[PDB]
Design a binder for this molecule. Structure first.
Ligand code: NI
Ligand code: NI
Lengths: 328, 336, 328, 336
């Protein structure tokens, strides 16, 4: 009897770097197992939109995106010996928001407690500069200070305007505490970049007392790693920024892979980029003011994902109050 | 300065050629060599002069009567728009859009709360001015209802203009704990919740009106309840979407419009919460000197409002339900 | 044996005008039948969110919304003798638009042909003033002229700015052909209202040659009925406008009930109001630039409904070109 | 007028205190009592002066070298923003938002097409200026690809700046008739269409680059094809969302940025089509004198662009796929 599920997988060597052989299997985001020489191999690093490369003599297998496939790599093809292991809703802003924020706070508190007990898991934030423009920067910094955040994935703008807020009270020249523009404020963000360039990097700015508050400050003080991916729209960038997209992508992937939850705060491109890198067993909270953006995040979803159509500015402020309440 | 040109209306609701069509700004007219202050500034209307009474008023075209003296052309008029800032703007600056969600929210909530506190203080002193709310049912759907009801309870609110949907979902949540069958406290749909909205309308129809439902103990909490208890007037305008308007609803749009105008025109501030229809309808009725705040999650709503003449509006592009919860906390902070 | 489906329906008299008895049946938008004194009655005027009132001695039944229920009316309650007869997709702007417009044009052409042969059916438009502001007014007027449109449901603003365009070339003072504002143009729409008030109504304005082009003109010339529902935001209004919402609602309901298709063009409140009045057997095309608006229209849908997230201005222009192509 | 103050950079990418941070406008600096025109106007950058060469240029901070003389403060500078209109605006007017979908679309399409026709004529005469397109993959998803490819074919387009997604979906539609597995001609998903996108990337990887795929007969139609055939340069910037960038993609954002800057800075017009990332990235690199048109279905996209300094942008809030189809028809009308 031929039963594809328990037949040995078929493999084909890639004929060129980054060229997938005909019949290649496209991965889900689910933990996958492949049968090779009569033994089930657990495929490392689950990720959607990739192929599986097999190392039969090492009895190992890993997920590889196309750009990392090398000539000679044995790519899984066909339909035999593939076992997928999945882990065990209309988008609208018109849903009770205090309620969902309270429920999110409860979940974060439970995740943080388990991280404290075990030292693994925890929460990554994917953040864009709207967090700062909407006045949500201090709330997010306080979450980092309270131990809720185990990593931040962002880019030059979030870091720059968070630092501009610290140094000058403004984001793109708008005063955070009053929402009024400051005369000549257009230069403030370039002055912030210059200040970090002079310090050498963010760590130096913090350790030397140039930078004394805010998200990046809290990350340095609490040893929270962050990844700042460079973008074609960047001013500067600051020294910490990884300018090559593919390098930044690799670093993002390794940063999120062991988290229990990723919270995506209003940045479609960074949030999609991050979701693309996540296995299905990570919980996702997707937050944006545009329903179409949230929808695009709810489309490539992990098995546990919620979308909240709301303004990150007020969302972060109320969320922090709910977290502060739980601290008591 | 020439005296204004005046010509009598030849028939009800028909105006002489060259008639002046008003801005939303206070306007004065020169009549028998004196400046007369035109009563009730409001855009897209006409100025009717009563020279023998030394008065003039802003009348909508459908209220103009045969023989009314209508201001013609632009001579002998003085229009007073809001004060321009003391200095020209900067050459180069960022984030200066009139309408965008990318603006510091805690800052603007603090500022709005300080102004509402000041305005409530003055209303308590004078018995005049005060604040009107214009609201849509998203206030309820997003969990903002309790916060707004509390502001009414605390004396911040002197009028509410809304429709059947706001009132009936507020009442749904008071009777059943849901809006659209979704539980306000948990954000989860409840079994049979799809019926709560019609049950709420049925209950008010049975009672006879909102006031009767409060008097009978049927309605015990919420925005409309607090209006009854605190004698805060409301105007509920009927709309073509209503299959079950409650008895309080004014089904004729012009009767509703006229009542809305007299309700808002003496307020110090109008806060518009998640309603395109009512934001624009109310702005169309308001003079430019009333502080106007338009809160919605859709920037296109605030832009539509400003595009239709309400250029004094301060837009806050944000989630109304979270905004109301935070605003209340800030008002409570100030009161302490 | 008791088989609810074929048991005689239970009825209860309403105890007060507009008060539904406990247990009332809430209607679908589907053709419904009720069993009364051992005979199946076909319920007139299917409509969702209503009750069914029965006249046993007349062997008839109709759908009544709550506001029309009268003391003594026998309202259908309970679970016996109710037979519903239904007639025999993710919302996104990122879908091939020329393609869907071509398909819509084909469908309209087939519907118009059948209306021409039979004299019944055809197409109603639900329209708001954005049709005029976006420069789509001439395209819609040409559809009326070509015989595609059997009714228009709108309000004071669409009519006012269509007439302002005819008389002065502007909508709210913006020139339609150049998109430039005209100095002093803010008065133009009130002048348009005044011009119709002087003529007496739209029909008089057309018959007297005051109004010589545009949507309202084409409706008068081609005997297309329209319903203009008054709104609290109205300037004027013009004489044709029905200022009472409930009267306007009744007139809208009777206008749409015999149509084969309703096309809803960017007006959330009018489009929802209209959808609420339609039986399930009418085809719907829902068009708006906001995904959340289209979603709200796709929620209360007839059994055949499509949503198109697009700008009505360019949509109408391209749609007309496709219809003009079919004319040849 | 004082001569400008200059101070040398103390280290690479570190500027002296008080350094001038540029606008997006042409700027002149007074050096040894002569006005020098600062090369390559671009915002959020610095002005480096070479007094002995009687020249100055706008350098981004990361290209500033130890010892470069950097303009300090605001003396001895002359900034030339776009010409202001001959008269102040009206007191009271409607629909004057910078960004709204409620504006006459046929009118603006006609105007854009006339300008593109004029600009193409001048480019054919001079070999300089011309038009760049900045585009996102929604061009393809909405059925606008064929229209844009035709504009390239007809000589309207001198450069394309985009990402992997635009190029690879264009190529998907050329090879398979789909974008995201949805058939362009029918708007229906096709069986197995979810694979077409990776098949298209695989095909280009196999060929070696886009040019090779065209030369081999693999790629026979579409935007990238027309760029190859007509020798129109493109810049495809890599992004962190790319798991399969094709070989043409520049993965380093600063290398991509520098190439984009030199590509756009000599154009007469830049048309940005459905891309927040590239609209803002390109606007950040552009002087204010280049005609800038930003087309998107989301008004917040155009507002974000203008909020970040590109205040010369003309926003067209519309469906890009329908817009491109209509624009092409108007260009074809003018050519006849
Ligand atoms: Ni889930
Ligand atoms: Ni259907």
């Amino acid at each position: 009897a031929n039963i594809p599920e328990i037949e040995n997988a078929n493999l084909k060597p890639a004929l060129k770097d980054s060229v997938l052989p005909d019949g290649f299997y496209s991965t889900t985001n689910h933990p996958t197992h492949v049968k090779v020489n009569d033994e089930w191999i657990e495929v490392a690093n689950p990720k959607m939109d990739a192929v599986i490369v097999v190392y039969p003599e090492e009895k190992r297998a890993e997920t590889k995106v196309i750009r990392k496939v090398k000539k000679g790599d044995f790519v899984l093809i066909g339909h035999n010996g593939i076992r997928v292991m999945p882990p065990e809703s209309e988008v609208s802003s018109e849903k009770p928001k205090e309620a969902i924020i309270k429920r999110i706070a409860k979940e974060m508190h439970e995740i943080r407690e388990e991280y404290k007990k075990t030292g693994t898991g925890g929460i990554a934030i994917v953040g864009g500069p709207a967090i700062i423009h909407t006045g949500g920067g201090p709330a997010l910094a306080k979450m980092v200070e309270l131990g809720y955040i185990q990593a931040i994935l962002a880019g030059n703008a979030l870091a720059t305007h968070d630092i501009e807020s610290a140094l000058y009270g403004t984001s793109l020249g708008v005063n955070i505490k009053t929402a009024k523009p400051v005369t000549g404020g257009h230069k403030h963000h370039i002055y912030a970049i210059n200040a970090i360039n002079d310090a050498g990097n963010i760590k130096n700015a913090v350790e030397s007392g140039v930078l004394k508050e805010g998200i990046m400050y809290q990350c340095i003080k609490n040893n929270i790693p962050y990844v700042l991916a460079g973008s074609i729209r960047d001013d500067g960038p600051i020294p910490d920024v990884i300018t090559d997209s593919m390098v930044a992508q690799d670093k993002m992937r390794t940063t999120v892979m062991d988290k229990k939850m990723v919270i995506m705060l209003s940045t479609l491109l960074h949030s999609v980029a991050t979701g693309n890198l996540m296995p299905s067993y990570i919980k996702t909270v997707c937050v944006d003011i545009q329903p179409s953006t949230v929808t695009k995040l709810m489309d490539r979803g992990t098995s546990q994902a919620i979308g909240v159509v709301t303004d990150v500015g007020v969302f972060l402020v109320l969320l922090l109050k709910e977290l502060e309440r739980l601290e008591l």
